Ligand binder design. Structure first.
Ligand SMILES: CCCCCCCCCCCCCCCCCC(=O)OC[C@H](COP(=O)(O)OC[C@H](N)C(=O)O)OC(=O)CCCCCCCCCCCCCCCCC
Ligand SMILES: CCCCCCCCCCCCCCCCCC(=O)OC[C@H](COP(=O)(O)OC[C@H](N)C(=O)O)OC(=O)CCCCCCCCCCCCCCCCC
Ligand SMILES: CCCCCCCCCCCCCCCCCC(=O)OC[C@H](COP(=O)(O)OC[C@H](N)C(=O)O)OC(=O)CCCCCCCCCCCCCCCCC
Ligand SMILES: O=P(O)(O)O[C@@H]1[C@H](O)[C@H](O)[C@@H](OP(=O)(O)O)[C@H](OP(=O)(O)O)[C@H]1O
Ligand SMILES: O=P(O)(O)O[C@@H]1[C@H](O)[C@H](O)[C@@H](OP(=O)(O)O)[C@H](OP(=O)(O)O)[C@H]1O
Ligand SMILES: O=P(O)(O)O[C@@H]1[C@H](O)[C@H](O)[C@@H](OP(=O)(O)O)[C@H](OP(=O)(O)O)[C@H]1O
Lengths: 271, 271, 271
């Protein structure tokens, strides 16, 4: 929390910063947002001023979650196609390079596969929140009607106390109060349960995806460790590379580890 | 690798699938790509048909990597603003909800902070690859000139063997061959080193980011475990919630764990 | 499996590739398919959109199998006529060539004979699959009627619960369910048996045909080993060739080996 504990907008030194200086900021960060034109802004603004006042914020949150989920699909597609392009480019080189590049592309290819399942779970969580939005939006009109009846009673009492509509209006008010007494309870009963369930599901999905990505990256580093390099003098010929079998075993082990992993067998143990 | 080992495009059953059935595919996946208009396609196509033939593919890969890095910035911004909106919405509710929601927003807020550093490291890796692209593009013209000289010699020998330009052309050819003999060696010397260094850096960054995200999610689940829920009957009043101190300790522990973590202290140990 | 384990569409090196470099791709592979006009496409498309939905795919598979079987007949006829043409051409040459060519044509002539029996067995397998297609297509309407009755009951219950048609419709539904309970079992009983029998028959036919072809080719090489060649200087006369008897013994042995071979005496023993 650099922003919270200091007025500075920079990054405070840490263990990672002390071990390795932070890299310079990315140069391809333009001033213009370019957030997919005005479609995002329209989807963001139109949803917050149409329906009932009680459920106005959750609709905006649902729309923003939809935009968040939409972006990751494009990211995953671009990464997969980048892996394909790297594999295509690696062909017209030396034997060892034409194999290590292909294996790295194959390994990189699974990030999009993981992201697809992550997106599906994200959509499930978004639907779970939409349910709460819907129920609260349906709940609001009862309290609206009760307030209207109370205001009508208050005005008609001031206008003239001799009107015969006092008794019927009072009975309607007590009926509306009796209805709202259970309406509020049934509204408050399910929010703390559905929110908890949705957030638990989201956190479990995040943990699983992160652990799978970390395992894939570790095995990719293990495979890349095999790529031998040494300076070559002009006129010399490098020895014939014979490492085809080891890479196959490495990727087979990667597949076995990815398939065998379960949620209960999580490697990361938070303190 | 479902695609590789089976002609089916579906997902083969696994341990996670057996434990929990896969969720249905996301409904908000339209047929139209909508990949930021035609700007992406133009950046993708114009770069592959302008420069030298040798370095045509790496320029396309660099552009695609730039698009990949650009997408994650928008994703992180949208996620951060979603967290802000959730924190804003959680205010007008019960005391426990008005605090758990704020703490969850605060915890979610750091994903964008991690993504910024990930993007910076991605840009560094992209520059490292661009260096190889540049050097190979500069290398190609020497072999181009050597091929041109060889073709000229071959044609002029056929035209008439009595020309006095045979000796000078042969000397130029041997000079170009002597130059290319060291040009090829100096081209091949640095590729296997720079590629290895860039990919090692990228994998280290991926591992660090994934482990930090997993730790944050685990501590978020630990904090959310405190949110007590129980059904309430109409007319009843829930007991006053007193859990302010525990959440502060939880987030302080999260900050301490995030700051203390180092690369050498990685929790995940690939087999 | 080059396609599965690598994004490349080329061929990975193997023992045969290392021993002998792969030949260049055939030059007479035009871009246009020329798959017998549009008759194949019409037979392929019309069959998949006419009958019941359940048995739509197996009809397409049967049609494609028919096309596959049809192609091999033309291939065998062309190969036989090629052998005849080679035998005709070999007449107007030296004595040894006018005999070796005839013997090779005679040996080549049996490939079409083997292909005819292979085609017959292929047709038998196709009929076996057509039986399954027919039975499943006949099975589907029972479940169709049950679904229709269920939908009618569901709609009529909503329309008005006081209708006297509830009891009769429920009895019809339970009758249809009792029928479908045995219909599904009788459908699933025979598929796993007929498919297994057909595929076993097809594999046995393939093994027999391949082994016979290999034996014929081996004996053809043995016969061709007799054709002596030596460079001849101008003005010299080659010695009179006397090898008529050996070729007759070779082809007699080929006939005896082809006739004696049985399925139980298969030379190839898979590990
Ligand atoms: C600076 C600038 O104006 O960028 C405008 C953007 C980016 O185009 P580019 O990086 O200059 O061109 C890349 C490639 N070399 C080319 O010449 O084409 O090109 C554009 O005009 C924006 C098109 C969509 C990109 C949205 C990101 C906006 C961030 C700024
Ligand atoms: C279906 C379809 O045509 O979507 C077109 C897209 C998405 O608009 P929407 O989801 O329908 O509207 C959301 C909100 N409820 C609204 O009414 O506004 O709206 C659009 O026209 C596309 C604008 C940019 C989104 C790019 C994603 C394309 C994927 C399809
Ligand atoms: C090239 C091309 O256009 O081939 C068109 C095909 C093949 O005719 P060809 O090989 O050129 O002629 C062979 C012979 N020397 C001749 O002159 O006649 O000739 C044709 O027009 C196609 C006729 C049927 C062949 C179907 C195979 C199509 C694959 C392409
Ligand atoms: O200043 P501009 O007009 O915006 O253009 C940028 C820069 O000037 C170079 O043309 C280019 O680097 P290279 O010459 O090395 O390709 C870079 O591409 P990049 O961002 O992908 O590195 C562009 O973004
Ligand atoms: O069919 P359309 O015209 O594309 O509109 C979709 C759907 O019909 C609803 O209007 C809406 O669900 P809700 O009524 O529950 O808001 C949904 O929003 P969503 O994708 O964000 O769920 C839209 O995508
Ligand atoms: O270019 P085209 O018009 O398609 O004709 C091809 C080629 O140019 C030659 O005419 C011929 O080789 P030959 O001169 O040696 O006969 C070849 O026959 P082939 O494919 O049977 O070898 C033809 O396919």
């Amino acid at each position: 929390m650099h922003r919270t504990y200091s007025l500075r907008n920079s990054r405070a030194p840490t263990a990672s910063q002390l071990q390795n200086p932070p890299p310079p900021p990315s140069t391809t960060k333009g001033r213009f947002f370019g957030k997919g034109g005005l479609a995002y802004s329209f989807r963001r603004s139109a949803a917050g001023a149409f329906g009932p006042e009680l459920s106005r914020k959750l609709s905006q949150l649902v729309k923003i979650e939809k935009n968040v989920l939409r972006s990751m699909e494009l990211t995953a597609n671009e990464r997969r196609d980048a892996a394909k392009q790297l594999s295509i480019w690696g062909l017209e080189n030396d034997d060892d390079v034409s194999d290590i590049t292909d294996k790295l592309g194959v390994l990189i290819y699974e990030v999009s596969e993981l992201d697809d399942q992550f997106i599906d779970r994200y959509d499930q969580y978004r639907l779970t929140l939409k349910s709460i939005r819907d129920i609260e939006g349906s709940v609001q009109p009862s309290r609206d009607r009760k307030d209207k009846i109370t205001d009508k009673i208050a005005y008609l009492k001031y206008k003239d106390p001799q009107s015969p509509k006092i008794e019927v209006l009072e009975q309607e008010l007590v009926r509306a109060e009796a209805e709202s007494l259970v309406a509020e309870a049934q509204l408050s009963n399910i929010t703390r349960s559905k929110l908890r369930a949705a957030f638990n599901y989201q956190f479990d999905s995040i943990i699983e995806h992160s652990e799978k990505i970390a395992l894939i990256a570790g095995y990719g580093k293990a495979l890349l460790e095999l790529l031998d390099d040494s300076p070559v003098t002009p006129g010399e010929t490098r020895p014939a590379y014979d490492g085809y079998e080891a890479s196959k075993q490495i990727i087979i082990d990667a597949e076995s580890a990815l398939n065998e992993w379960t949620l209960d067998s999580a490697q990361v143990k938070p303190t």
